[PDB]
């Protein structure tokens, strides 16, 4: 019979600004009155959370809400947690106390912080998201920029976007005390406002002992701080070793990927096969893609718009007929490499099976990925981790 | 320490046709080789399911998939279960062995089978859904907007129905109804997943379900526009006092002509023992999000001044923009959507008699071809 | 002793839309229920006005008000009247019943309608104006476009712009019955709204006989309809002859000019001497120029804005000091060739003196004017007329 | 049929210095070679003007031009005329021959000369103006520490024009007009003044019988104190109308002062003006367009104000933090800007019977002078009508 501590709800962030204001915020700003720490001139918000010492099992739910506060763009986002087992992390790097470890250039070029190294474990992602174009700030009924960009089939713009995911598997990374944060690749002073809620529901069953969950971050190419766009996959596969000190049963891989390069023909808009392997065996092999981005239209008041001519069938006063029309196409409608402006990203899972104690290899290959070329910022945001029960 | 029976998965239907073929199927066709029973000329498919005698708690998940097999329309659908405590049900009515009880015309007009009566409990809905326009059969441009790169080939809905386990326990007849009138019809799939608790001490709670109302016109029934003349009021009995009772309410508005209840906002007010427990406008304003599931929808050209990027920067011009019937805002659904029931915490209910009332006061009457109506089902759930 | 008819006020236009909607309006649309006639797809609004047969002298005041209705730009405008003595005019040209007369290419190239010809007298301008950038439509307190474009020294945007001029000298062109209108070089469907009021204040003096005023339009390069950008001054002076049927005493010339070509280094932004002559004698010789456009800032919420670095002296907490800052400069702040976005244009006057009956010459020279070059639309909008009492 | 005398143009002052040089000019200096009389050490310039005996109606236009000749601040100014009907005036007070009448302290404290008294009618203002910060002398390259990027060039002087036809009776035949500037520097300013009288071309157009009656003037021309009296009491006074008058109009000229932070120069204060116990004006004297005068203020003080600003950068529209210059001259003020004149507010009073009438000016939240905080209100008022 285990004691009940009760549920825990945390309003981590509440319309907390995420922006780029290098005159107000340097690489590191200590905790403000609300506990918010800011890194990289405001592009990263961070907060220490405490959770009671749960003995019973729990369910963990994450709810992230974003709105533009002026920034018009669809920027990349990462809700994350600093790994507890890592001496080096984003915060003490920002403070100037540490640095990402140097990497072997034959394997990882100049891609610091994407794989583990001495005293370093890559940042763990709680949720990858992509902001829509200007939701909120540009969403009013008579907004001077978006009011005549609203298609006839969209009765009203949404005022914000919200994503919810079960992250129970990540409880080990949140337990007792942890630093969680949100990063948005924003370069405007107006930026965004972000909200984040953690809901920990404690089991009502007296006998329900908390299982021994484990999490092992493997990789993270998100360019949080002093990092470079990850187009490395265009020249080489990213291969790394990892250790399993103890044999583990029924291990699962979680893989989070989005493709980027927003110019015409860039990796944001072209299909590229991802092949992920463990110990030389393929465990995921698929094209990260979405063809439903029109479904996010009401979240994108400030998206760009083009007129595409098309012969359209329709019902006129004298029955069915056809005519040439000029049909609006929004940038937000376009199919993309595993996301849409206004979507989150569900991690792909793969059941790895049992892993013996000892050395193992992990490989991520996006063989036709394109190189950065001047202003063509082709890259792939990839993070991965393992989870299992001991 | 309770024994583990393990999980149970049932592929109830698998691309099972739902159609209207009165030359092949009469009002009742007994179970075929795959266990499928057909009622009303194929408009209803039904199957007996069996589940192990679970002692531990469980989670129940329902997954329904639909595709057109030629039918072009957005027709109403109901995935349901025949209440175990009812002598009279859709099946024995179809067999010609029973009939919905006659009703008091002062209270319910000619709306047979929508409320309980002698030996009758209304059908219980596991999931209300609305088919999209021709998904699958018509999914391969004059129809496809430039912002839709490809049509989906089918539509799928998933809901947790754990609270309905008592209606499914041991043995039950589940089915799918689609208001289809074509021989080509649809194909429907249905999966039930019962995930048993991995915890040794986790005793199954004593869940209860009590169906109160169901206006879905399954068989020999009339369009439910009754709300336009009177509120639907009924009594129900609670044999035992119950704590923390919850009401689940499933509503969709209908009448697909211009200005009909499918397309106009109407406040729904639901009461128990004279106290309002729900009061809201059932509405959806996001139906454009379902566009890729509607290849066969009707289309109009609407004029509009539009902002766009031309060769000399941003500018504006008059255009004629396609608007699909499927894009239109509706009374709590879209072609291709399911319906999440609204919940309300009723609180404690004493043993004895109680009243239940559903009021949609501005609902419109059927008028010739204007088929205004409201599909409403409701039930109570609680633990003893 | 002359009878008093009293004053006459006419609300010619009242937030009447001026726009470019070729699918709704062809070259000519007849008078609507309010008397408004539309030409050139909505770019020109026109209306027949009637005035009592005044015997006493009068004062005529014109009041034009404009607001954007979505069009973001600072477009050229002309409030005008169709000359009574002209068989051919903008309206019957729009109706397809007439055409500007063909011109001698050695003198006027392909600049149709800018000088008189057979059955044609150039349009007479009541007022030349330049719309500001988006006033009204983009002027609200929290407008998503103009909100952070408001300089600290501008407490609030204006919601419209209004110009008033005395046009008493033009009474002969308005007398009894006349067609007046407004043209705006708008190419957007949203366009503008325009208002126009004529106030005729009758003299209170019993003996005050109306003088015999005369008006003679000479030139007008405004491209109202099927006309070309007037960069002709870059290759040749515009010279023309005119006839004075009767000798006239103390004749005055009125000259309305604005320079154009909004690209960097174009005639909108460069000083160009104008030299105007009658019978070979210079009567005006000046640089049409304004250096006070910053004064119109509150009318230009949608103007473009740049950040210009500058070392600025200021009072800080430790006394007088200096620092590098980035100071906003608006397109509307820039000095221009005789106008600002949001200004009207006061005609320059010159006392010509007496003119004998017969032939006379008139010449307008802007010798360093630039040519049109692809997208560089250099030109000069020039109109001129004579006025005198007989 | 009335004879035509033709138009009259008078160049009253032409870059005539207005300054404070007590060693060169005492309280009174008689007319110099150009007819210029100087009072209070140069702070006031004065000149006798003559106008033909016009029988037809006329229009009177006043054009005043000012430039700094070294004086850097935005000082108060008053273009005026000595009332013809007054025995006591600024000039004979300066000469030491007369004095403002003593006042009742319970009503007017120590505010001499602001209301009428025995043998005294307050000075009549043709135009109230406020000099800009150093125009001309400091009105000088591409990058400048003082000149904002949106100001291509400083103006070299400032000019104001007003129709003052209603004031013809105060100018008729012969009158002493002048300019006062509250300057305390030896460098001071230069001032120009032109009067243009345009005679009607109509034979029948008889000049109407216009009248002017000065009521109040708190401008501290000579041996006078800053007028913060409104902060303790309303200014109430009586006046006499020897003959009944029809359709009388009140003209009220007000500017608020106290140039320190939070002073009456920069705070909104309701003015309530009453005649015979009825309110005739009730309003906040205010201007919110002072940025429009920027090019006339080269020597103004400047602050840096932080703000997020939208702008076009090389990669499209964006926003960033900046420190934006705000000039003292840009600030909203109590009915003026550095470089502006003041249009009088008018009110139609209606008919006034012959006899006694009362007039009252109340600025109830006006602030008191406090050491170097020189809060005050410059107010003048007069009546006009046709008989």
mmCIF file with all atom_site columns, N, CA and C in Angstrom, chain C residues 148-153 155 207-208 294 304-308 310-315 323 325-328 333 335, chain D residues 144-145 147-150 152 202 204 288 291-292 295 302-304 307 309-312 317 320 322-325 330:
data_model
loop_
_atom_site.group_PDB
_atom_site.id
_atom_site.type_symbol
_atom_site.label_atom_id
_atom_site.label_alt_id
_atom_site.label_comp_id
_atom_site.label_asym_id
_atom_site.label_entity_id
_atom_site.label_seq_id
_atom_site.pdbx_PDB_ins_code
_atom_site.Cartn_x
_atom_site.Cartn_y
_atom_site.Cartn_z
_atom_site.occupancy
_atom_site.B_iso_or_equiv
_atom_site.pdbx_formal_charge
_atom_site.auth_seq_id
_atom_site.auth_comp_id
_atom_site.auth_asym_id
_atom_site.auth_atom_id
_atom_site.pdbx_PDB_model_num
ATOM 1   N N  . UNK C 1 148 ? 3.838   49.325  -35.063 1.00 0.00 ? 148 UNK C N  1
ATOM 2   C CA . UNK C 1 148 ? 5.249   49.576  -34.682 1.00 0.00 ? 148 UNK C CA 1
ATOM 3   C C  . UNK C 1 148 ? 6.023   50.384  -35.727 1.00 0.00 ? 148 UNK C C  1
ATOM 4   N N  . UNK C 1 149 ? 5.273   51.033  -36.594 1.00 0.00 ? 149 UNK C N  1
ATOM 5   C CA . UNK C 1 149 ? 5.848   51.937  -37.544 1.00 0.00 ? 149 UNK C CA 1
ATOM 6   C C  . UNK C 1 149 ? 5.646   53.373  -37.074 1.00 0.00 ? 149 UNK C C  1
ATOM 7   N N  . UNK C 1 150 ? 4.845   53.584  -36.024 1.00 0.00 ? 150 UNK C N  1
ATOM 8   C CA . UNK C 1 150 ? 4.577   54.924  -35.507 1.00 0.00 ? 150 UNK C CA 1
ATOM 9   C C  . UNK C 1 150 ? 5.766   55.467  -34.714 1.00 0.00 ? 150 UNK C C  1
ATOM 10  N N  . UNK C 1 151 ? 6.402   56.525  -35.222 1.00 0.00 ? 151 UNK C N  1
ATOM 11  C CA . UNK C 1 151 ? 7.492   57.134  -34.459 1.00 0.00 ? 151 UNK C CA 1
ATOM 12  C C  . UNK C 1 151 ? 6.993   57.704  -33.153 1.00 0.00 ? 151 UNK C C  1
ATOM 13  N N  . UNK C 1 152 ? 7.879   57.780  -32.161 1.00 0.00 ? 152 UNK C N  1
ATOM 14  C CA . UNK C 1 152 ? 7.508   58.307  -30.848 1.00 0.00 ? 152 UNK C CA 1
ATOM 15  C C  . UNK C 1 152 ? 6.903   59.743  -30.871 1.00 0.00 ? 152 UNK C C  1
ATOM 16  N N  . UNK C 1 153 ? 7.342   60.563  -31.814 1.00 0.00 ? 153 UNK C N  1
ATOM 17  C CA . UNK C 1 153 ? 6.907   61.945  -31.917 1.00 0.00 ? 153 UNK C CA 1
ATOM 18  C C  . UNK C 1 153 ? 5.554   62.095  -32.641 1.00 0.00 ? 153 UNK C C  1
ATOM 19  N N  . UNK C 1 155 ? 1.859   61.124  -32.032 1.00 0.00 ? 155 UNK C N  1
ATOM 20  C CA . UNK C 1 155 ? 0.974   60.452  -31.065 1.00 0.00 ? 155 UNK C CA 1
ATOM 21  C C  . UNK C 1 155 ? -0.107  59.591  -31.663 1.00 0.00 ? 155 UNK C C  1
ATOM 22  N N  . UNK C 1 207 ? -24.433 95.959  -54.838 1.00 0.00 ? 207 UNK C N  1
ATOM 23  C CA . UNK C 1 207 ? -23.812 96.469  -56.058 1.00 0.00 ? 207 UNK C CA 1
ATOM 24  C C  . UNK C 1 207 ? -22.800 95.509  -56.697 1.00 0.00 ? 207 UNK C C  1
ATOM 25  N N  . UNK C 1 208 ? -22.374 94.472  -55.971 1.00 0.00 ? 208 UNK C N  1
ATOM 26  C CA . UNK C 1 208 ? -21.236 93.614  -56.376 1.00 0.00 ? 208 UNK C CA 1
ATOM 27  C C  . UNK C 1 208 ? -21.496 92.685  -57.577 1.00 0.00 ? 208 UNK C C  1
ATOM 28  N N  . UNK C 1 294 ? 8.404   65.536  -43.870 1.00 0.00 ? 294 UNK C N  1
ATOM 29  C CA . UNK C 1 294 ? 8.273   64.952  -42.563 1.00 0.00 ? 294 UNK C CA 1
ATOM 30  C C  . UNK C 1 294 ? 7.031   65.480  -41.875 1.00 0.00 ? 294 UNK C C  1
ATOM 31  N N  . UNK C 1 304 ? 6.693   52.901  -46.162 1.00 0.00 ? 304 UNK C N  1
ATOM 32  C CA . UNK C 1 304 ? 7.817   52.051  -45.869 1.00 0.00 ? 304 UNK C CA 1
ATOM 33  C C  . UNK C 1 304 ? 8.688   52.771  -44.849 1.00 0.00 ? 304 UNK C C  1
ATOM 34  N N  . UNK C 1 305 ? 9.480   51.996  -44.103 1.00 0.00 ? 305 UNK C N  1
ATOM 35  C CA . UNK C 1 305 ? 10.409  52.522  -43.108 1.00 0.00 ? 305 UNK C CA 1
ATOM 36  C C  . UNK C 1 305 ? 11.762  51.823  -43.109 1.00 0.00 ? 305 UNK C C  1
ATOM 37  N N  . UNK C 1 306 ? 12.812  52.621  -43.047 1.00 0.00 ? 306 UNK C N  1
ATOM 38  C CA . UNK C 1 306 ? 14.164  52.120  -43.028 1.00 0.00 ? 306 UNK C CA 1
ATOM 39  C C  . UNK C 1 306 ? 14.809  52.571  -41.755 1.00 0.00 ? 306 UNK C C  1
ATOM 40  N N  . UNK C 1 307 ? 15.855  51.868  -41.338 1.00 0.00 ? 307 UNK C N  1
ATOM 41  C CA . UNK C 1 307 ? 16.659  52.298  -40.191 1.00 0.00 ? 307 UNK C CA 1
ATOM 42  C C  . UNK C 1 307 ? 17.991  52.891  -40.688 1.00 0.00 ? 307 UNK C C  1
ATOM 43  N N  . UNK C 1 308 ? 18.243  54.158  -40.356 1.00 0.00 ? 308 UNK C N  1
ATOM 44  C CA . UNK C 1 308 ? 19.438  54.837  -40.804 1.00 0.00 ? 308 UNK C CA 1
ATOM 45  C C  . UNK C 1 308 ? 20.313  55.048  -39.595 1.00 0.00 ? 308 UNK C C  1
ATOM 46  N N  . UNK C 1 310 ? 23.014  56.770  -37.238 1.00 0.00 ? 310 UNK C N  1
ATOM 47  C CA . UNK C 1 310 ? 23.446  58.138  -37.029 1.00 0.00 ? 310 UNK C CA 1
ATOM 48  C C  . UNK C 1 310 ? 24.008  58.278  -35.611 1.00 0.00 ? 310 UNK C C  1
ATOM 49  N N  . UNK C 1 311 ? 25.035  59.109  -35.446 1.00 0.00 ? 311 UNK C N  1
ATOM 50  C CA . UNK C 1 311 ? 25.505  59.423  -34.118 1.00 0.00 ? 311 UNK C CA 1
ATOM 51  C C  . UNK C 1 311 ? 24.605  60.542  -33.646 1.00 0.00 ? 311 UNK C C  1
ATOM 52  N N  . UNK C 1 312 ? 23.978  60.382  -32.498 1.00 0.00 ? 312 UNK C N  1
ATOM 53  C CA . UNK C 1 312 ? 23.026  61.394  -32.030 1.00 0.00 ? 312 UNK C CA 1
ATOM 54  C C  . UNK C 1 312 ? 23.411  61.927  -30.690 1.00 0.00 ? 312 UNK C C  1
ATOM 55  N N  . UNK C 1 313 ? 23.305  63.235  -30.558 1.00 0.00 ? 313 UNK C N  1
ATOM 56  C CA . UNK C 1 313 ? 23.525  63.914  -29.298 1.00 0.00 ? 313 UNK C CA 1
ATOM 57  C C  . UNK C 1 313 ? 22.225  63.868  -28.527 1.00 0.00 ? 313 UNK C C  1
ATOM 58  N N  . UNK C 1 314 ? 22.314  63.677  -27.216 1.00 0.00 ? 314 UNK C N  1
ATOM 59  C CA . UNK C 1 314 ? 21.122  63.605  -26.401 1.00 0.00 ? 314 UNK C CA 1
ATOM 60  C C  . UNK C 1 314 ? 21.447  63.811  -24.941 1.00 0.00 ? 314 UNK C C  1
ATOM 61  N N  . UNK C 1 315 ? 20.408  64.009  -24.142 1.00 0.00 ? 315 UNK C N  1
ATOM 62  C CA . UNK C 1 315 ? 20.556  64.185  -22.728 1.00 0.00 ? 315 UNK C CA 1
ATOM 63  C C  . UNK C 1 315 ? 20.312  62.843  -22.077 1.00 0.00 ? 315 UNK C C  1
ATOM 64  N N  . UNK C 1 323 ? 25.710  58.914  -29.014 1.00 0.00 ? 323 UNK C N  1
ATOM 65  C CA . UNK C 1 323 ? 25.723  57.492  -29.227 1.00 0.00 ? 323 UNK C CA 1
ATOM 66  C C  . UNK C 1 323 ? 25.230  57.126  -30.596 1.00 0.00 ? 323 UNK C C  1
ATOM 67  N N  . UNK C 1 325 ? 22.874  55.265  -33.000 1.00 0.00 ? 325 UNK C N  1
ATOM 68  C CA . UNK C 1 325 ? 21.501  54.799  -32.956 1.00 0.00 ? 325 UNK C CA 1
ATOM 69  C C  . UNK C 1 325 ? 21.109  54.472  -34.367 1.00 0.00 ? 325 UNK C C  1
ATOM 70  N N  . UNK C 1 326 ? 19.957  53.827  -34.495 1.00 0.00 ? 326 UNK C N  1
ATOM 71  C CA . UNK C 1 326 ? 19.386  53.469  -35.761 1.00 0.00 ? 326 UNK C CA 1
ATOM 72  C C  . UNK C 1 326 ? 18.063  54.200  -35.816 1.00 0.00 ? 326 UNK C C  1
ATOM 73  N N  . UNK C 1 327 ? 18.018  55.239  -36.648 1.00 0.00 ? 327 UNK C N  1
ATOM 74  C CA . UNK C 1 327 ? 16.876  56.128  -36.684 1.00 0.00 ? 327 UNK C CA 1
ATOM 75  C C  . UNK C 1 327 ? 15.923  55.858  -37.845 1.00 0.00 ? 327 UNK C C  1
ATOM 76  N N  . UNK C 1 328 ? 14.610  55.760  -37.542 1.00 0.00 ? 328 UNK C N  1
ATOM 77  C CA . UNK C 1 328 ? 13.661  55.479  -38.589 1.00 0.00 ? 328 UNK C CA 1
ATOM 78  C C  . UNK C 1 328 ? 13.547  56.630  -39.560 1.00 0.00 ? 328 UNK C C  1
ATOM 79  N N  . UNK C 1 333 ? 8.774   60.732  -45.495 1.00 0.00 ? 333 UNK C N  1
ATOM 80  C CA . UNK C 1 333 ? 9.646   61.845  -45.039 1.00 0.00 ? 333 UNK C CA 1
ATOM 81  C C  . UNK C 1 333 ? 10.529  62.463  -46.140 1.00 0.00 ? 333 UNK C C  1
ATOM 82  N N  . UNK C 1 335 ? 12.246  64.240  -49.288 1.00 0.00 ? 335 UNK C N  1
ATOM 83  C CA . UNK C 1 335 ? 11.996  65.432  -50.102 1.00 0.00 ? 335 UNK C CA 1
ATOM 84  C C  . UNK C 1 335 ? 11.635  65.003  -51.542 1.00 0.00 ? 335 UNK C C  1
ATOM 85  N N  . UNK D 2 144 ? 24.557  64.154  -38.992 1.00 0.00 ? 144 UNK D N  1
ATOM 86  C CA . UNK D 2 144 ? 24.477  65.218  -38.050 1.00 0.00 ? 144 UNK D CA 1
ATOM 87  C C  . UNK D 2 144 ? 24.081  64.718  -36.663 1.00 0.00 ? 144 UNK D C  1
ATOM 88  N N  . UNK D 2 145 ? 24.626  65.341  -35.631 1.00 0.00 ? 145 UNK D N  1
ATOM 89  C CA . UNK D 2 145 ? 24.350  64.890  -34.293 1.00 0.00 ? 145 UNK D CA 1
ATOM 90  C C  . UNK D 2 145 ? 23.030  65.433  -33.797 1.00 0.00 ? 145 UNK D C  1
ATOM 91  N N  . UNK D 2 147 ? 20.481  67.004  -36.274 1.00 0.00 ? 147 UNK D N  1
ATOM 92  C CA . UNK D 2 147 ? 19.497  66.857  -37.350 1.00 0.00 ? 147 UNK D CA 1
ATOM 93  C C  . UNK D 2 147 ? 19.087  65.401  -37.603 1.00 0.00 ? 147 UNK D C  1
ATOM 94  N N  . UNK D 2 148 ? 17.810  65.077  -37.353 1.00 0.00 ? 148 UNK D N  1
ATOM 95  C CA . UNK D 2 148 ? 17.364  63.713  -37.637 1.00 0.00 ? 148 UNK D CA 1
ATOM 96  C C  . UNK D 2 148 ? 17.408  63.408  -39.132 1.00 0.00 ? 148 UNK D C  1
ATOM 97  N N  . UNK D 2 149 ? 17.544  62.124  -39.474 1.00 0.00 ? 149 UNK D N  1
ATOM 98  C CA . UNK D 2 149 ? 17.645  61.665  -40.876 1.00 0.00 ? 149 UNK D CA 1
ATOM 99  C C  . UNK D 2 149 ? 16.431  62.064  -41.722 1.00 0.00 ? 149 UNK D C  1
ATOM 100 N N  . UNK D 2 150 ? 15.274  62.240  -41.087 1.00 0.00 ? 150 UNK D N  1
ATOM 101 C CA . UNK D 2 150 ? 14.051  62.612  -41.794 1.00 0.00 ? 150 UNK D CA 1
ATOM 102 C C  . UNK D 2 150 ? 13.901  64.108  -42.002 1.00 0.00 ? 150 UNK D C  1
ATOM 103 N N  . UNK D 2 152 ? 15.752  66.943  -43.937 1.00 0.00 ? 152 UNK D N  1
ATOM 104 C CA . UNK D 2 152 ? 16.888  67.217  -44.832 1.00 0.00 ? 152 UNK D CA 1
ATOM 105 C C  . UNK D 2 152 ? 17.618  68.532  -44.574 1.00 0.00 ? 152 UNK D C  1
ATOM 106 N N  . UNK D 2 202 ? -14.631 97.487  -54.522 1.00 0.00 ? 202 UNK D N  1
ATOM 107 C CA . UNK D 2 202 ? -16.054 97.780  -54.771 1.00 0.00 ? 202 UNK D CA 1
ATOM 108 C C  . UNK D 2 202 ? -16.459 99.178  -54.287 1.00 0.00 ? 202 UNK D C  1
ATOM 109 N N  . UNK D 2 204 ? -19.393 100.654 -53.670 1.00 0.00 ? 204 UNK D N  1
ATOM 110 C CA . UNK D 2 204 ? -20.421 100.739 -52.642 1.00 0.00 ? 204 UNK D CA 1
ATOM 111 C C  . UNK D 2 204 ? -19.965 100.204 -51.273 1.00 0.00 ? 204 UNK D C  1
ATOM 112 N N  . UNK D 2 288 ? -0.975  68.744  -30.377 1.00 0.00 ? 288 UNK D N  1
ATOM 113 C CA . UNK D 2 288 ? -0.426  67.410  -30.438 1.00 0.00 ? 288 UNK D CA 1
ATOM 114 C C  . UNK D 2 288 ? 0.308   67.189  -31.767 1.00 0.00 ? 288 UNK D C  1
ATOM 115 N N  . UNK D 2 291 ? 5.651   67.835  -33.732 1.00 0.00 ? 291 UNK D N  1
ATOM 116 C CA . UNK D 2 291 ? 6.681   67.252  -34.573 1.00 0.00 ? 291 UNK D CA 1
ATOM 117 C C  . UNK D 2 291 ? 6.738   67.957  -35.891 1.00 0.00 ? 291 UNK D C  1
ATOM 118 N N  . UNK D 2 292 ? 5.624   68.541  -36.304 1.00 0.00 ? 292 UNK D N  1
ATOM 119 C CA . UNK D 2 292 ? 5.581   69.211  -37.603 1.00 0.00 ? 292 UNK D CA 1
ATOM 120 C C  . UNK D 2 292 ? 6.464   70.426  -37.676 1.00 0.00 ? 292 UNK D C  1
ATOM 121 N N  . UNK D 2 295 ? 11.783  71.000  -38.203 1.00 0.00 ? 295 UNK D N  1
ATOM 122 C CA . UNK D 2 295 ? 12.820  71.644  -39.000 1.00 0.00 ? 295 UNK D CA 1
ATOM 123 C C  . UNK D 2 295 ? 13.133  73.073  -38.576 1.00 0.00 ? 295 UNK D C  1
ATOM 124 N N  . UNK D 2 302 ? 17.318  66.864  -26.831 1.00 0.00 ? 302 UNK D N  1
ATOM 125 C CA . UNK D 2 302 ? 16.972  65.547  -27.363 1.00 0.00 ? 302 UNK D CA 1
ATOM 126 C C  . UNK D 2 302 ? 17.153  64.447  -26.315 1.00 0.00 ? 302 UNK D C  1
ATOM 127 N N  . UNK D 2 303 ? 16.232  63.490  -26.277 1.00 0.00 ? 303 UNK D N  1
ATOM 128 C CA . UNK D 2 303 ? 16.336  62.279  -25.434 1.00 0.00 ? 303 UNK D CA 1
ATOM 129 C C  . UNK D 2 303 ? 16.314  61.017  -26.301 1.00 0.00 ? 303 UNK D C  1
ATOM 130 N N  . UNK D 2 304 ? 16.787  59.888  -25.772 1.00 0.00 ? 304 UNK D N  1
ATOM 131 C CA . UNK D 2 304 ? 16.661  58.599  -26.462 1.00 0.00 ? 304 UNK D CA 1
ATOM 132 C C  . UNK D 2 304 ? 15.570  57.779  -25.769 1.00 0.00 ? 304 UNK D C  1
ATOM 133 N N  . UNK D 2 307 ? 12.263  51.535  -27.960 1.00 0.00 ? 307 UNK D N  1
ATOM 134 C CA . UNK D 2 307 ? 11.040  50.984  -28.495 1.00 0.00 ? 307 UNK D CA 1
ATOM 135 C C  . UNK D 2 307 ? 11.375  49.910  -29.533 1.00 0.00 ? 307 UNK D C  1
ATOM 136 N N  . UNK D 2 309 ? 10.756  48.639  -33.119 1.00 0.00 ? 309 UNK D N  1
ATOM 137 C CA . UNK D 2 309 ? 10.323  49.270  -34.365 1.00 0.00 ? 309 UNK D CA 1
ATOM 138 C C  . UNK D 2 309 ? 10.323  48.360  -35.552 1.00 0.00 ? 309 UNK D C  1
ATOM 139 N N  . UNK D 2 310 ? 9.309   48.513  -36.400 1.00 0.00 ? 310 UNK D N  1
ATOM 140 C CA . UNK D 2 310 ? 9.190   47.750  -37.639 1.00 0.00 ? 310 UNK D CA 1
ATOM 141 C C  . UNK D 2 310 ? 9.963   48.467  -38.710 1.00 0.00 ? 310 UNK D C  1
ATOM 142 N N  . UNK D 2 311 ? 10.656  47.708  -39.560 1.00 0.00 ? 311 UNK D N  1
ATOM 143 C CA . UNK D 2 311 ? 11.427  48.311  -40.620 1.00 0.00 ? 311 UNK D CA 1
ATOM 144 C C  . UNK D 2 311 ? 11.724  47.303  -41.711 1.00 0.00 ? 311 UNK D C  1
ATOM 145 N N  . UNK D 2 312 ? 12.156  47.796  -42.877 1.00 0.00 ? 312 UNK D N  1
ATOM 146 C CA . UNK D 2 312 ? 12.534  46.898  -44.010 1.00 0.00 ? 312 UNK D CA 1
ATOM 147 C C  . UNK D 2 312 ? 14.038  46.711  -43.943 1.00 0.00 ? 312 UNK D C  1
ATOM 148 N N  . UNK D 2 317 ? 10.504  42.669  -44.245 1.00 0.00 ? 317 UNK D N  1
ATOM 149 C CA . UNK D 2 317 ? 10.011  43.396  -43.021 1.00 0.00 ? 317 UNK D CA 1
ATOM 150 C C  . UNK D 2 317 ? 10.353  42.666  -41.725 1.00 0.00 ? 317 UNK D C  1
ATOM 151 N N  . UNK D 2 320 ? 12.956  45.326  -34.465 1.00 0.00 ? 320 UNK D N  1
ATOM 152 C CA . UNK D 2 320 ? 14.139  45.308  -33.618 1.00 0.00 ? 320 UNK D CA 1
ATOM 153 C C  . UNK D 2 320 ? 14.079  46.453  -32.633 1.00 0.00 ? 320 UNK D C  1
ATOM 154 N N  . UNK D 2 322 ? 15.320  49.665  -30.817 1.00 0.00 ? 322 UNK D N  1
ATOM 155 C CA . UNK D 2 322 ? 16.074  50.844  -31.139 1.00 0.00 ? 322 UNK D CA 1
ATOM 156 C C  . UNK D 2 322 ? 15.913  51.846  -30.020 1.00 0.00 ? 322 UNK D C  1
ATOM 157 N N  . UNK D 2 323 ? 16.752  52.887  -30.086 1.00 0.00 ? 323 UNK D N  1
ATOM 158 C CA . UNK D 2 323 ? 16.750  54.012  -29.129 1.00 0.00 ? 323 UNK D CA 1
ATOM 159 C C  . UNK D 2 323 ? 16.478  55.210  -29.958 1.00 0.00 ? 323 UNK D C  1
ATOM 160 N N  . UNK D 2 324 ? 15.240  55.664  -29.893 1.00 0.00 ? 324 UNK D N  1
ATOM 161 C CA . UNK D 2 324 ? 14.751  56.662  -30.829 1.00 0.00 ? 324 UNK D CA 1
ATOM 162 C C  . UNK D 2 324 ? 14.831  58.059  -30.261 1.00 0.00 ? 324 UNK D C  1
ATOM 163 N N  . UNK D 2 325 ? 15.476  58.973  -30.996 1.00 0.00 ? 325 UNK D N  1
ATOM 164 C CA . UNK D 2 325 ? 15.502  60.348  -30.593 1.00 0.00 ? 325 UNK D CA 1
ATOM 165 C C  . UNK D 2 325 ? 14.121  61.019  -30.573 1.00 0.00 ? 325 UNK D C  1
ATOM 166 N N  . UNK D 2 330 ? 9.300   68.250  -30.235 1.00 0.00 ? 330 UNK D N  1
ATOM 167 C CA . UNK D 2 330 ? 8.272   67.311  -30.687 1.00 0.00 ? 330 UNK D CA 1
ATOM 168 C C  . UNK D 2 330 ? 7.112   67.171  -29.689 1.00 0.00 ? 330 UNK D C  1
#
